Coordinates of C-alpha atoms and ligand atoms in Angstrom, one line a residue:
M274 CA 96.4 -24.8 -70.9
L275 CA 99.4 -22.6 -69.5
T276 CA 103.2 -23.5 -70.2
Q277 CA 105.6 -23.2 -67.4
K278 CA 107.0 -20.2 -69.0
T279 CA 103.6 -18.4 -69.1
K280 CA 102.9 -19.1 -65.5
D281 CA 106.2 -17.6 -64.7
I282 CA 105.5 -14.3 -66.5
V283 CA 101.9 -14.4 -64.4
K284 CA 104.1 -14.9 -61.1
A285 CA 106.6 -12.2 -62.2
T286 CA 103.9 -9.5 -63.1
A287 CA 101.0 -10.0 -60.8
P288 CA 102.2 -7.3 -58.4
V289 CA 102.3 -4.7 -61.5
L290 CA 98.6 -5.5 -62.3
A291 CA 97.8 -5.2 -58.3
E292 CA 99.6 -1.7 -58.0
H293 CA 97.6 -0.4 -61.1
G294 CA 94.6 -2.0 -59.9
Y295 CA 92.7 1.4 -59.3
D296 CA 93.1 2.7 -62.8
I297 CA 92.5 -0.8 -64.5
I298 CA 89.3 -1.2 -62.6
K299 CA 88.2 2.3 -63.7
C300 CA 89.2 1.6 -67.0
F301 CA 87.8 -1.8 -67.5
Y302 CA 84.3 -0.5 -66.6
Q303 CA 84.1 2.7 -68.5
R304 CA 85.2 0.4 -71.7
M305 CA 82.9 -2.3 -70.7
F306 CA 79.7 -0.2 -69.9
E307 CA 80.2 1.9 -73.0
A308 CA 80.0 -1.5 -75.3
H309 CA 77.5 -2.9 -73.1
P310 CA 75.5 -0.6 -70.9
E311 CA 72.9 -3.4 -70.0
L312 CA 75.7 -5.0 -67.9
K313 CA 74.9 -2.3 -65.4
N314 CA 72.0 -4.2 -64.2
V315 CA 74.2 -7.2 -63.2
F316 CA 77.1 -5.0 -61.5
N317 CA 76.8 -3.3 -58.2
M318 CA 76.6 0.5 -58.8
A319 CA 77.3 1.7 -55.4
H320 CA 80.7 0.1 -55.0
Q321 CA 82.0 3.3 -53.5
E322 CA 82.6 3.5 -56.3
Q323 CA 85.2 1.0 -57.0
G324 CA 87.6 0.8 -53.6
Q325 CA 86.4 -2.5 -52.4
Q326 CA 87.3 -4.1 -55.6
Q327 CA 90.6 -2.7 -55.9
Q328 CA 91.3 -4.4 -52.6
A329 CA 89.7 -7.7 -54.0
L330 CA 91.7 -7.5 -57.0
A331 CA 95.0 -6.8 -55.4
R332 CA 94.4 -9.9 -53.2
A333 CA 93.1 -12.1 -55.9
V334 CA 95.9 -11.6 -58.5
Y335 CA 98.4 -12.2 -55.7
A336 CA 96.8 -15.3 -54.4
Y337 CA 96.4 -16.7 -58.0
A338 CA 100.0 -16.0 -58.9
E339 CA 100.8 -17.6 -55.7
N340 CA 98.8 -20.7 -56.3
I341 CA 99.1 -21.2 -59.9
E342 CA 101.3 -24.4 -59.5
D343 CA 98.7 -25.8 -57.2
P344 CA 95.4 -26.6 -59.3
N345 CA 93.6 -28.0 -56.2
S346 CA 93.7 -24.9 -54.1
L347 CA 92.7 -23.1 -57.2
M348 CA 89.7 -25.1 -57.9
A349 CA 88.4 -24.5 -54.3
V350 CA 88.0 -20.7 -54.7
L351 CA 87.0 -21.0 -58.3
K352 CA 84.0 -23.0 -56.6
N353 CA 83.0 -19.9 -54.4
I354 CA 83.3 -17.6 -57.5
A355 CA 81.3 -20.1 -59.8
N356 CA 78.5 -20.2 -56.9
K357 CA 78.5 -16.4 -56.8
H358 CA 78.3 -16.1 -60.5
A359 CA 75.5 -18.7 -60.7
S360 CA 73.8 -16.6 -58.2
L361 CA 74.0 -13.5 -60.5
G362 CA 73.0 -15.5 -63.6
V363 CA 76.5 -15.0 -65.4
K364 CA 76.2 -16.4 -69.0
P365 CA 79.0 -18.1 -70.9
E366 CA 78.4 -15.3 -73.6
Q367 CA 79.5 -12.5 -71.3
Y368 CA 83.1 -14.2 -71.1
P369 CA 84.4 -12.8 -74.3
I370 CA 82.9 -9.5 -73.3
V371 CA 84.8 -9.0 -69.9
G372 CA 87.7 -10.6 -71.5
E373 CA 88.1 -7.8 -74.1
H374 CA 87.7 -5.2 -71.8
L375 CA 89.8 -6.5 -69.0
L376 CA 92.5 -6.8 -71.6
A377 CA 92.0 -3.5 -73.1
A378 CA 92.2 -2.2 -69.9
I379 CA 95.0 -3.7 -68.6
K380 CA 97.0 -2.8 -71.9
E381 CA 96.0 1.0 -71.5
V382 CA 96.7 1.4 -68.0
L383 CA 100.3 -0.4 -68.4
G384 CA 101.0 1.3 -71.3
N385 CA 104.6 0.8 -72.3
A386 CA 105.2 -1.9 -69.5
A387 CA 102.4 -4.0 -71.3
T388 CA 104.9 -6.1 -73.5
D389 CA 103.5 -9.0 -75.8
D390 CA 104.6 -11.4 -73.3
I391 CA 102.7 -9.9 -70.4
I392 CA 99.5 -9.3 -72.2
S393 CA 99.9 -12.9 -73.9
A394 CA 100.2 -14.5 -70.5
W395 CA 97.0 -12.8 -68.6
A396 CA 95.0 -13.4 -71.8
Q397 CA 95.8 -16.9 -71.6
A398 CA 95.0 -16.9 -67.7
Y399 CA 91.8 -15.1 -68.6
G400 CA 91.0 -17.9 -70.9
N401 CA 92.0 -20.7 -68.8
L402 CA 89.9 -19.6 -65.8
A403 CA 86.9 -18.5 -68.0
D404 CA 86.8 -22.1 -69.4
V405 CA 86.8 -23.7 -65.7
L406 CA 84.3 -21.3 -64.4
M407 CA 81.7 -21.6 -67.1
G408 CA 81.7 -25.4 -67.0
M409 CA 81.2 -25.1 -63.2
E410 CA 78.4 -22.6 -63.6
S411 CA 76.7 -24.5 -66.1
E412 CA 76.8 -27.6 -64.1
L413 CA 75.4 -25.5 -61.2
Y414 CA 72.7 -24.1 -63.3
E415 CA 71.5 -27.6 -64.4
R416 CA 71.5 -28.9 -61.0
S417 CA 69.2 -26.4 -60.0
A418 CA 66.9 -26.7 -62.8
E419 CA 66.5 -30.5 -62.3
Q420 CA 65.6 -30.6 -58.8
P421 CA 62.1 -30.3 -57.3
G422 CA 61.1 -26.7 -57.1
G423 CA 64.3 -25.5 -58.9
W424 CA 65.0 -23.1 -61.9
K425 CA 67.2 -21.4 -63.9
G426 CA 67.5 -17.3 -64.0
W427 CA 65.0 -15.5 -62.0
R428 CA 61.7 -16.6 -60.4
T429 CA 58.8 -14.3 -59.3
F430 CA 58.2 -14.2 -55.5
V431 CA 55.8 -12.5 -53.4
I432 CA 56.3 -11.1 -50.0
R433 CA 53.9 -12.9 -47.7
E434 CA 55.3 -11.5 -44.2
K435 CA 57.5 -8.7 -43.4
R436 CA 58.4 -8.5 -39.6
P437 CA 60.8 -6.3 -37.9
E438 CA 63.5 -8.2 -35.9
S439 CA 65.0 -5.4 -34.3
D440 CA 65.8 -1.6 -35.0
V441 CA 67.7 -2.5 -38.1
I442 CA 66.9 -5.9 -39.3
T443 CA 63.8 -6.8 -40.9
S444 CA 62.6 -10.3 -42.2
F445 CA 60.8 -11.1 -45.5
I446 CA 58.9 -14.3 -46.1
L447 CA 58.7 -15.2 -49.7
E448 CA 56.6 -17.6 -51.7
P449 CA 56.8 -18.0 -55.6
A450 CA 54.1 -16.3 -57.5
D451 CA 53.5 -19.3 -59.4
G452 CA 52.4 -21.2 -56.2
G453 CA 54.6 -24.3 -56.7
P454 CA 57.2 -25.9 -54.5
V455 CA 60.6 -24.3 -54.0
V456 CA 63.9 -26.2 -54.4
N457 CA 65.8 -27.4 -51.0
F458 CA 69.0 -25.9 -50.1
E459 CA 72.0 -26.2 -47.7
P460 CA 71.6 -24.3 -44.5
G461 CA 73.9 -21.4 -45.1
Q462 CA 73.1 -20.8 -48.5
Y463 CA 71.9 -17.6 -50.1
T464 CA 69.5 -16.4 -52.6
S465 CA 70.2 -13.1 -54.7
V466 CA 67.2 -10.7 -54.8
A467 CA 67.1 -8.7 -58.2
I468 CA 65.0 -5.7 -58.0
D469 CA 64.8 -2.4 -59.9
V470 CA 66.5 0.7 -58.1
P471 CA 64.4 4.0 -59.2
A472 CA 67.0 6.2 -58.1
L473 CA 69.5 4.6 -60.4
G474 CA 66.9 3.6 -63.2
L475 CA 68.7 0.2 -63.2
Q476 CA 68.1 -3.3 -61.9
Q477 CA 70.3 -4.0 -59.0
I478 CA 71.3 -7.6 -57.4
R479 CA 72.4 -8.4 -53.8
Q480 CA 72.7 -11.7 -51.9
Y481 CA 70.9 -12.5 -48.8
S482 CA 71.3 -15.6 -46.7
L483 CA 68.5 -17.9 -46.4
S484 CA 67.6 -17.3 -42.7
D485 CA 65.2 -20.1 -42.0
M486 CA 65.3 -23.8 -42.7
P487 CA 64.2 -25.6 -45.8
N488 CA 60.3 -26.1 -45.6
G489 CA 59.7 -26.7 -49.5
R490 CA 57.2 -23.7 -49.6
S491 CA 58.9 -20.5 -48.8
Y492 CA 62.2 -18.7 -48.0
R493 CA 63.1 -16.1 -45.6
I494 CA 65.6 -13.4 -45.8
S495 CA 66.6 -11.0 -43.2
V496 CA 67.8 -7.6 -44.1
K497 CA 69.9 -5.2 -42.2
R498 CA 69.1 -1.4 -43.4
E499 CA 72.6 0.1 -44.3
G500 CA 71.6 3.5 -43.2
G501 CA 73.0 7.1 -42.8
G502 CA 75.4 8.7 -40.8
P503 CA 78.0 10.5 -43.1
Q504 CA 78.1 7.4 -45.3
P505 CA 75.4 7.4 -48.3
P506 CA 72.4 4.9 -47.5
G507 CA 72.4 1.5 -49.1
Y508 CA 70.6 1.1 -52.3
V509 CA 68.7 -2.2 -51.9
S510 CA 68.4 -2.6 -48.2
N511 CA 66.8 0.8 -47.8
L512 CA 64.5 0.0 -50.9
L513 CA 63.2 -3.3 -49.1
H514 CA 62.8 -1.5 -45.8
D515 CA 60.8 1.3 -46.8
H516 CA 59.2 0.3 -50.3
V517 CA 58.6 -3.6 -50.5
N518 CA 55.7 -4.7 -48.7
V519 CA 53.2 -7.5 -48.1
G520 CA 52.0 -8.3 -51.5
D521 CA 54.8 -6.9 -53.7
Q522 CA 57.1 -8.8 -56.0
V523 CA 60.7 -9.5 -56.4
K524 CA 63.0 -11.9 -58.6
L525 CA 65.0 -14.4 -56.5
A526 CA 68.0 -16.6 -57.7
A527 CA 68.2 -20.3 -56.8
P528 CA 70.1 -21.2 -53.6
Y529 CA 74.0 -21.2 -54.1
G530 CA 76.9 -20.8 -52.1
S531 CA 79.6 -22.9 -50.7
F532 CA 79.2 -22.2 -46.9
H533 CA 77.1 -24.6 -45.2
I534 CA 76.5 -27.4 -42.7
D535 CA 77.0 -31.0 -43.8
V536 CA 73.4 -31.9 -42.8
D537 CA 74.0 -35.8 -42.7
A538 CA 77.0 -35.2 -40.4
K539 CA 76.4 -35.9 -36.6
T540 CA 79.6 -34.3 -35.3
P541 CA 79.1 -30.9 -33.3
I542 CA 78.7 -27.2 -34.7
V543 CA 80.0 -23.8 -33.3
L544 CA 78.0 -21.2 -34.7
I545 CA 79.8 -17.6 -34.4
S546 CA 78.1 -14.6 -35.6
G547 CA 78.4 -10.7 -35.4
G548 CA 75.6 -8.7 -36.2
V549 CA 73.5 -9.6 -39.2
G550 CA 76.1 -12.2 -39.9
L551 CA 73.6 -14.5 -37.7
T552 CA 71.1 -15.0 -40.8
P553 CA 72.9 -18.0 -42.0
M554 CA 73.4 -19.3 -38.3
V555 CA 69.8 -19.5 -37.9
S556 CA 69.1 -22.0 -40.9
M557 CA 71.8 -24.1 -39.5
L558 CA 70.6 -23.8 -35.7
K559 CA 67.0 -25.1 -36.9
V560 CA 68.1 -27.7 -39.1
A561 CA 70.7 -29.2 -36.6
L562 CA 68.4 -29.2 -33.6
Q563 CA 66.4 -32.1 -35.1
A564 CA 68.1 -35.5 -35.2
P565 CA 70.4 -36.8 -32.4
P566 CA 71.5 -34.7 -30.7
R567 CA 73.4 -32.8 -32.8
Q568 CA 75.0 -30.2 -30.3
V569 CA 74.9 -26.6 -31.2
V570 CA 76.9 -23.8 -29.6
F571 CA 75.1 -20.4 -30.7
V572 CA 77.6 -17.7 -30.1
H573 CA 76.4 -14.1 -31.0
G574 CA 77.8 -10.6 -30.6
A575 CA 75.6 -7.6 -31.0
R576 CA 75.6 -3.9 -30.1
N577 CA 72.8 -4.1 -27.6
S578 CA 69.2 -5.5 -27.3
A579 CA 67.8 -2.8 -29.6
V580 CA 69.8 -4.0 -32.6
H581 CA 70.0 -7.7 -31.6
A582 CA 67.9 -9.9 -34.0
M583 CA 65.7 -12.8 -33.1
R584 CA 66.5 -12.2 -29.7
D585 CA 63.4 -13.7 -27.8
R586 CA 63.4 -16.7 -30.3
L587 CA 67.1 -17.8 -29.4
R588 CA 66.4 -17.2 -25.7
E589 CA 63.2 -19.6 -25.8
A590 CA 65.2 -22.3 -28.1
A591 CA 68.0 -22.3 -25.5
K592 CA 65.7 -23.3 -22.7
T593 CA 63.8 -25.7 -24.8
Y594 CA 66.7 -27.8 -26.3
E595 CA 69.4 -29.5 -24.3
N596 CA 71.8 -29.8 -27.2
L597 CA 71.9 -25.9 -27.5
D598 CA 74.1 -23.5 -25.6
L599 CA 73.4 -19.8 -26.0
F600 CA 76.2 -17.3 -25.5
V601 CA 75.3 -13.7 -26.3
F602 CA 77.9 -10.6 -26.1
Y603 CA 76.8 -7.0 -26.0
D604 CA 79.4 -4.5 -27.2
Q605 CA 77.8 -1.6 -25.7
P606 CA 75.0 -2.4 -23.6
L607 CA 72.0 -0.2 -23.1
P608 CA 71.0 0.8 -19.6
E609 CA 67.9 -1.6 -19.5
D610 CA 70.4 -4.3 -20.9
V611 CA 71.6 -6.3 -17.8
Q612 CA 74.4 -8.9 -17.8
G613 CA 73.6 -12.5 -16.4
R614 CA 70.1 -11.7 -17.5
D615 CA 69.6 -9.9 -21.1
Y616 CA 73.0 -11.1 -22.2
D617 CA 76.0 -13.2 -20.9
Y618 CA 79.0 -11.3 -21.3
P619 CA 79.9 -7.5 -22.3
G620 CA 82.5 -6.6 -25.1
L621 CA 83.1 -8.5 -28.2
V622 CA 82.7 -12.2 -28.9
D623 CA 85.8 -13.9 -27.1
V624 CA 86.0 -17.5 -27.4
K625 CA 88.5 -17.8 -24.4
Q626 CA 85.7 -16.8 -22.3
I627 CA 83.7 -19.7 -23.1
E628 CA 86.7 -22.1 -24.0
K629 CA 85.4 -25.3 -22.5
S630 CA 82.0 -24.7 -24.0
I631 CA 83.0 -24.3 -27.7
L632 CA 85.9 -26.7 -27.9
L633 CA 83.7 -29.9 -28.4
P634 CA 85.7 -32.5 -29.7
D635 CA 86.4 -32.8 -33.7
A636 CA 83.7 -29.9 -34.1
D637 CA 83.1 -27.6 -37.2
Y638 CA 83.3 -23.7 -36.6
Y639 CA 81.2 -21.6 -38.8
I640 CA 81.9 -17.7 -38.6
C641 CA 79.9 -15.0 -40.2
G642 CA 80.0 -11.1 -39.6
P643 CA 82.2 -7.9 -40.3
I644 CA 85.8 -8.7 -41.7
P645 CA 87.8 -7.6 -38.6
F646 CA 85.3 -9.7 -36.4
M647 CA 86.0 -12.8 -38.5
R648 CA 89.8 -12.3 -38.6
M649 CA 89.4 -12.0 -34.6
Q650 CA 87.3 -15.1 -34.3
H651 CA 89.4 -17.1 -36.9
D652 CA 92.6 -16.0 -35.0
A653 CA 91.2 -17.0 -31.7
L654 CA 90.0 -20.5 -32.7
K655 CA 93.4 -21.2 -34.3
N656 CA 95.1 -20.1 -31.0
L657 CA 93.3 -23.0 -29.5
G658 CA 94.5 -25.3 -31.9
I659 CA 91.5 -26.2 -34.3
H660 CA 92.6 -27.2 -37.5
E661 CA 92.2 -24.7 -40.5
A662 CA 90.3 -27.2 -42.3
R663 CA 87.6 -27.2 -39.3
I664 CA 86.8 -23.4 -39.8
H665 CA 84.4 -22.3 -42.3
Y666 CA 83.5 -18.7 -43.0
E667 CA 81.4 -16.5 -45.3
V668 CA 82.0 -13.0 -46.2
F669 CA 79.0 -10.5 -46.9
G670 CA 81.0 -8.8 -49.6
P671 CA 83.4 -9.6 -52.4
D672 CA 86.4 -11.8 -51.2
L673 CA 88.8 -13.9 -50.5
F674 CA 89.4 -11.8 -47.3
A675 CA 90.3 -14.1 -44.4
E676 CA 91.7 -16.8 -46.7
Ligands
FAD729 C1 77.0 -14.2 -49.5 C2 76.4 -13.0 -49.1 C3 75.5 -13.0 -48.1 C4 74.8 -12.1 -47.5 N1 73.7 -12.1 -46.7 C5 73.1 -10.9 -46.0 C6 71.9 -11.1 -45.1 O1 71.7 -12.1 -44.8 N2 71.5 -10.0 -44.6 C7 71.8 -8.6 -45.0 O2 71.3 -7.5 -44.6 N3 72.9 -8.6 -46.0 C8 73.4 -9.8 -46.2 N4 74.5 -9.5 -47.3 C9 74.8 -8.2 -47.7 C10 73.9 -7.7 -49.0 O3 74.0 -8.5 -50.0 C11 74.1 -6.3 -49.5 O4 75.6 -5.8 -49.7 C12 73.7 -5.3 -48.4 O5 72.5 -5.6 -48.1 C13 73.9 -3.8 -48.7 O6 73.4 -3.7 -50.0 P1 72.8 -2.2 -50.4 O7 72.2 -2.1 -51.8 O8 71.8 -1.8 -49.4 O9 74.0 -1.2 -50.5 P2 75.0 -0.8 -51.8 O10 74.0 0.3 -52.2 O11 75.5 -2.0 -52.7 O12 76.2 0.2 -50.9 C14 76.8 -0.7 -50.1 C15 77.6 0.0 -48.7 O13 78.4 0.9 -49.0 C16 77.9 2.1 -48.3 N5 78.3 3.1 -49.6 C17 77.5 3.4 -50.6 N6 78.1 4.7 -51.2 C18 79.2 4.9 -50.4 C19 80.1 5.8 -50.8 N7 80.1 6.4 -52.0 N8 81.1 6.1 -49.8 C20 81.2 5.3 -48.7 N9 80.2 4.5 -48.6 C21 79.2 4.3 -49.4 C22 76.4 2.0 -48.4 O14 75.9 2.7 -47.3 C23 76.4 0.5 -47.9 O15 76.6 0.2 -46.5 C24 75.0 -10.4 -48.0 C25 76.1 -10.5 -48.8 C26 76.8 -11.7 -49.5 C27 77.8 -11.6 -50.5
HEM730 C1 87.6 -15.4 -66.1 C2 86.7 -14.7 -65.9 C3 85.9 -14.2 -64.5 C4 86.8 -14.2 -63.4 C5 88.0 -14.6 -62.9 C6 85.9 -13.7 -62.2 C7 86.3 -13.6 -61.0 C8 85.4 -13.1 -60.1 C9 85.6 -12.9 -58.6 C10 86.9 -13.3 -57.9 C11 84.4 -12.2 -58.1 C12 84.3 -11.8 -56.7 C13 83.7 -12.9 -56.1 C14 82.7 -12.7 -54.8 O1 82.4 -11.4 -54.5 O2 82.9 -13.7 -54.2 C15 83.7 -11.9 -59.3 C16 82.5 -11.4 -59.2 C17 81.8 -11.0 -60.0 N1 81.8 -11.3 -61.5 FE1 83.1 -12.3 -62.2 N2 84.9 -13.1 -62.9 C18 85.0 -13.5 -64.2 C19 84.0 -13.2 -65.2 C20 82.7 -12.7 -65.1 C21 81.8 -12.5 -66.0 C22 82.0 -13.1 -67.5 C23 80.7 -11.6 -65.7 C24 79.6 -11.5 -66.5 C25 78.7 -10.3 -66.2 C26 81.0 -11.4 -64.3 C27 80.5 -10.8 -63.5 C28 80.6 -10.8 -62.0 C29 79.7 -9.8 -61.0 C30 78.6 -9.1 -61.5 C31 80.6 -10.0 -59.7 C32 80.1 -9.5 -58.4 C33 81.1 -8.3 -58.1 C34 80.1 -7.2 -57.8 O3 79.5 -7.2 -56.5 O4 79.7 -6.2 -58.6 N3 82.3 -12.0 -63.9 N4 84.2 -12.5 -60.4
ECN731 CL1 93.5 -5.4 -63.8 C1 92.5 -6.8 -63.5 C2 93.1 -8.2 -63.3 C3 92.4 -9.4 -63.1 C4 91.0 -9.1 -62.9 C5 90.1 -10.5 -62.9 O1 88.9 -10.3 -62.6 C6 88.2 -8.9 -62.5 C7 87.1 -8.9 -63.5 N1 85.9 -9.2 -63.5 C8 84.8 -8.3 -62.9 C9 83.8 -9.2 -62.4 N2 84.2 -10.4 -62.6 C10 85.1 -10.5 -63.2 C11 87.6 -8.7 -61.3 C12 87.4 -9.6 -60.4 C13 86.8 -9.5 -59.3 C14 86.6 -8.1 -58.8 CL2 85.9 -8.0 -57.1 C15 87.0 -7.1 -59.7 C16 87.6 -7.3 -61.0 CL3 87.9 -6.2 -62.2 C17 90.5 -7.8 -63.0 C18 91.1 -6.7 -63.3

């Protein structure tokens, strides 16, 4: 537990760590993987190769230092991290490993600036946080294990169905190879696919939102091909698209995540998604639609019809259910796409254009999609006067972003 003096050093030195983030990250991974190559099966080996994490790291040390006197705010984001670590299968015995290399890295990068006081302070902060996280991750592991259909670590699943949803998004329906029940989850939650990457000669792990409702038998994920156009292709998403088929096997983690609807609630929901960001919205849609009433506004932005996933299914849903409003935005509509017919509005999702349809009293708003899309939606919702507490978001990447 941290003395006042220790927290003050953290507050005074976080900028130094954030400034040297690139070199630290680079040194940390060089050291850790030399000591423990096997850890390369748990981390992302694309990472580009570390840029996104430097951003994450810079934001994370600042926010930590900015909230070190407020344990409640700190507990909340720790929960999101525990959930992500639980999904990856992070183990208490790995905490001393990360710690040594992180500290050895920080020390080697700061060199002369790495005083005893400073190294002592971040080392205590590493330990304080390690403790909290391990306890949270353990409690999450036990809760999955004990529930009907639950498990710890990886369970083998077989692909039963593989269906294209658009040019770029394909669904996979998964049943356990053992043939038993699967655990319940909250709409909005994710699994993690663990699979061997031939090009890498390594296992890689990626999160995917569970895109259908709980049924007790199977899970659905819906995967966007992260393809070419100067940028290198994604590892796992291309692998699922081209090389995984009906009858092949993957490993899955139990459902985790802190982004979801309260199923027992009867208050309304506004579901705002961009592109593949729709995947957890569909699960929330399908659940909320049973039980009086409940009231769902499904607001989706896509490029056009070619890349619009689940297009015919949502359209049919909007004419079968009185409690569902559908609003579709097309950013660059194809010539065969016609407004007032195949989509509602052109351009980006803009909540002002449907303001009275979305501002249901004491609603909950849920946002998923690319970061600038989420800032944009968050901002717009906040200019209508919705309380920060009523806006919920999930990042398809590290972070900690639109915090
Ligand atoms: C909570 C959560 C939920 C998610 N839900 C979904 C979902 O429902 N559906 C879905 O499709 N995805 C979802 N994702 C995203 C998904 O987990 C993966 O990040 C995504 O599928 C890409 O993985 P990959 O292995 O294909 O790409 P990686 O190999 O991990 O590469 C990542 C990206 O960087 C690019 N890149 C790689 N190398 C470079 C380079 N050196 N220079 C520049 N760019 C580079 C790649 O093209 C790719 O777009 C979710 C993520 C999270 C965190
Ligand atoms: C105090 C110790 C730790 C802290 C504060 C910490 C914090 C974080 C944070 C902030 C993230 C990003 C969360 C997200 O993407 O939503 C993360 C991700 C991650 N952590 Fe930790 N973590 C710690 C320890 C560990 C340990 C011990 C392991 C064991 C291998 C580990 C493995 C990972 C992995 C694999 C990711 C995902 C990043 C990626 O995509 O590669 N972490 N952690
Ligand atoms: Cl200089 C420094 C100071 C504090 C941390 C704190 O956390 C580190 C270690 N780590 C990695 C995975 N899990 C934990 C980290 C977190 C998140 C991300 Cl996205 C990258 C990193 Cl490196 C890291 C470098």
